[PDB]
Symmetry: D3
Subunit: 251 residues, 6 copies
């Protein structure tokens, strides 16, 4: 079925958001690893402002990733502890100014003839069963599927009763309504809902789909973390450092 993952890496800026690291590696790579362990090895990167940074990275992938030896005499570069990644990574310049829907539209070409394809934000990691979501999408037959998740807390949480605060928790790990965690599974017709570069995916497209009854939610009550804040960064880095990263399911 679906075999390609489209990732958003444009927007604000410096380097692109997905280039921010964790454990010395761009978050973008962490997400690629997530898909890859779920058998998805074809990637399309929607680049924007500072995109070349992303290009340079992949163009010098091993140099970035490992220790090397330059055998000058032979004009050869030896990679130590080389860990090959059987990926196809397409880097598409999608516009310095495009919106999320716009970027997707831009890459239509690359997924236009697939049953379904995966699409996600370049800043969120999780221990999500990618395969599961695919099968789920196939099963429900809708045009689209999103991964619903519990968000990080950004404020001081309150347990109020009778005007009395029974309990107080500073930025707790989200426990009410699930939100858009990204990790979409989509049919290529969704692109038809995108008008142009200025289209924001989370706007008309998504609302319409929900509206049309064409949008399903795969609920993921488990680990999911976006990297928006420094606190996020630190949190994520700690997890990684401590050897306790729930999204790191690979060898």
């Amino acid at each position: 079925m679906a075999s390609k993952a489209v990732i958003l890496a444009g927007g604000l800026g410096v380097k692109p958001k997905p280039m921010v690291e964790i454990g010395g590696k761009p978050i973008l790579w962490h997400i690629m690893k997530m898909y890859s362990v779920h058998g998805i090895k074809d990637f399309i990167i929607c680049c924007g402002y500072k995109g070349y940074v992303i290009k340079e990275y992949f163009a010098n992938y091993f140099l970035h990733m490992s220790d090397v030896t330059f055998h000058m005499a032979e004009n050869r570069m030896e990679v130590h502890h080389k860990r090959v990644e059987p990926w196809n990574v397409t880097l598409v310049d999608t516009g310095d100014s495009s919106m999320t829907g716009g970027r997707l539209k831009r890459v239509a070409e690359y997924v236009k003839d697939d049953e379904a394809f995966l699409f996600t934000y370049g800043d969120g990691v999780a221990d999500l069963d990618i395969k599961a979501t695919i099968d789920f999408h196939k099963a429900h037959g809708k045009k689209a599927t999103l991964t619903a998740t519990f968000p990080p807390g950004r404020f001081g949480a309150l347990d109020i009763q009778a005007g009395q605060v029974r309990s107080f928790q500073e930025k707790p790990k989200g426990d009410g309504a699930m939100i858009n965690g990204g990790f979409f599974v989509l049919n290529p017709s969704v692109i038809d809902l995108i008008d142009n570069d200025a289209t924001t995916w989370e706007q008309e497209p998504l609302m319409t789909l929900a509206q049309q009854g064409e949008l399903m939610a795969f609920e993921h009550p488990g680990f999911w973390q976006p990297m928006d804040t420094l606190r996020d960064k630190v949190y994520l880095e700690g997890l990684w450092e401590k050897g306790k990263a729930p999204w790191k399911t690979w060898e």
Copy 2:
């Protein structure tokens, strides 16, 4: 009763967060205006890193705020359309590294002999009835009162049913549980719960109080906006520009 407002303006950095403007004026000033219209005119500013910026501002208040004429010959500076503010503004250096509880402790001196005092974050504005909260605090007799509010949305909101997303809304204006909007009313004993500079208010102090049944919530279902993001900034600036700022209740 309570007649002094303690405001947090330390932390991260550049200029201090409260110095970020809206309509050409630091948000900090907007908050001061909020209190001032509710009769609170004594202020204590907990300064940290880049604090001098805040000092310079108040030290050159009118120069910052209005058009002026320097009558050089007479060594006089004339202020056009001068709008006097009958305030007492104390600027206290509370530490480059202190935590929120730490900063409060630092300024104990200044409120230690008051029935109660006001305390708030230097980054949130609202159309809150300050007087109301005071009276409310007096009435309930607890050690502390906080203002509960509906937070801004940071993610794509979902209406799910039977795995189907009935509706999708990108970062909607918060509609479930109220959170810590700040705007506290406190008795000086709360300070006793603060151990040192590294104490984070939202931690032990607050949890304890709730825990001890010493923490009440004044619910404010209306306008409240923190300035955390640029989107926040833009939103706030628009409101201000458009002449539609709910927190601007003054003349």
Copy 3:
């Protein structure tokens, strides 16, 4: 007659363009000195982005300009070699985004009831007879007068004949058509030609005036230099350093 000089100091940015120095003093001050020696001592500064820089300067004029002694015990600051300037300097915030015409409009208030007033760019100096231009404007009775000047060369000048370059001169001191050197003398009705903040003076207003036959040119074949480039800067600074600044006509 005319007794006030309106100076443009908004636009791009860092510090405001007029704040760039020559001989350790902002060019703006050099221009003020030019007017001042011609008896003009009332100034209106149209401030924009970074305007406060200008405000701080005038607010700490002597501190900026001379050596000082702080008699701490007496809370007194003594100025060495103090050189008083009997000026009235109005600093008006004219908008971060306004155009030149827009800024002028903004300050209408300040010259609205004068026979005529002076207006100029905050980046050009010259050995112009200010009084002369005033009298000239009074004499011709038109709504407006501008100072026409020979511009600095920005390219390699050519003397061609019969396809042959007879002579080549790199960025020569301008010798054909005079251009807008600024230094205007105007009647307050010109303001009526300004629609809003976005009005660029050099556009509709000026073209109309010329068009209406309401615009005269006081030709200044002598010294006039704008500070646009670094080369300009260096040139100007050299002149100043060498004690050969044609615009420095004061004591």
Copy 4:
């Protein structure tokens, strides 16, 4: 005859001036395209400060220019919509401090045995008939030929008569004397007029040549734009965006 184009890309700084883009491509590339459409495909780039930037660009030419796919498994990079450029591009480090004449001297080696060669500034584009200028140079038999052009306006243009400004135009498209538009055609003996690194081409060399009657002018009354200012940049970018770039004569 002449088959190599020498381009100046040193001087001030950040990235080199010629690296500034238009339509996402360095202006330098636009100029190369100009020559290339006129059959000139051998280039010599006089690099200076930040030169490596230029080197990296050419070294990763397609990566910079197009969308790519990294077939990781095969260690292959696939270029989408590849547009080959049959050029030879020599990058010579000509000194961080050298002057224009100095840089040329530096590259003598590369054109020393040619009938004639082309030389130009890395910041100006035009719809110039390169071939035409070559033939013209061959025809006149002089040591040197330059392209004369109408410059952009930097000031407010005036139509004065009898002290009256008949018309006013803000920075009009130049209509008097033609200037040095660059785009030279030269015989290698001109190098003999260059003494060292500090030689500025537009100085002694050029003046001498004119002086010696060895300098001809190919007048180009048409499109020619240098990129000196941001206004220039914007103007150029607009033209390009609008699909109305007179210098873009290629497919």
Copy 5:
């Protein structure tokens, strides 16, 4: 006798070197405190590049140094825990480019009619008996006196014998030859040895004096630390923080 201290605060840059802090106060202030406790309360500051920073500081001395209350209504600023300093502080602009001797020459005016005066670097602190050095200078009758000190270690120290390193110490607290610790006591005739702005004190002037037998050394085997490196900074800050600063001899 000597009653004025001349301090060097020009050179490299950002803020001036002497403005770098320790315990939240510019090192410059620490040195002033050193003199002040030894009865020296008249200061002359040789300012250079970024000098205004120094000016602003003294101009807003208490605002910088303490907590304040702005009694807006009364246009009054109240200083908390005010600690008056009965100093006279002259700030002289001595040139962005001048050398140390040059700066001194610049301020001749200010000490020209004193028996002797003090002169020092704005970056070194110590527990030196200032009075002692004065008396010493008076006693020896030479034109000049310098304070000799043991310098901080910048390298790995070695105890070698017979090619064997008996002991190794990383950047130890200096134990061989004393160096120029500054803290000079001078007669005004030394100025005659200074030719111009480009004169470096430590060059001709000092060598000559030694040479002429006009230079004495007051040896200070105790505490003396220059702030050149960050390590220096950290070291100094630690000392200060720990309440173990040997130079802090005041109340």
Copy 6:
């Protein structure tokens, strides 16, 4: 015997210290040249923060080092005046935070089975007889050998007698005790003295060795210069420019 040189290039930051240039080449390269002329052609670079900069350099060695021609049509890059370096250069990421001993430990793998190996700082050059030091180390049979040198002066040097400064010299070329000039020759057992990443070589390891009588000193009374200061930089660059670099012993 010893055939590999381990070089420290981590620490503070921007680019890595060893990347700072002299004569347009990173100092690191100068040191490599020093070893290389002494027959040492196997290198191990201990990288830290900004390490990739070092990686990119070696990965694009000739592009950095020489003039090139890109034969686009053939996808070939031609190097002019190519000067091959028969080196093996290993780049190991040794930690953003590691200490000098820590970094060495990190690379143990690479020298663990050698009789001895060379180790040095990436910021010091000299006309040292590398071979000599090796033979010397072999001869003395100790675990370690260091190169002792005379350091640059950082202060004003004094010749005192009887309280009188007989002579004064500003930052003279060091003439008392030799210091740690680096350029070590070591047996791999020294690594056993390194506990972790936080180990500073110059601490426990070195002191112990000296202490244990396992540390010898090869005294180099000749040319040795570290690049710590800008003055250092300038000095070194001058030497290089003037064609008088004592460390440049190669062709």
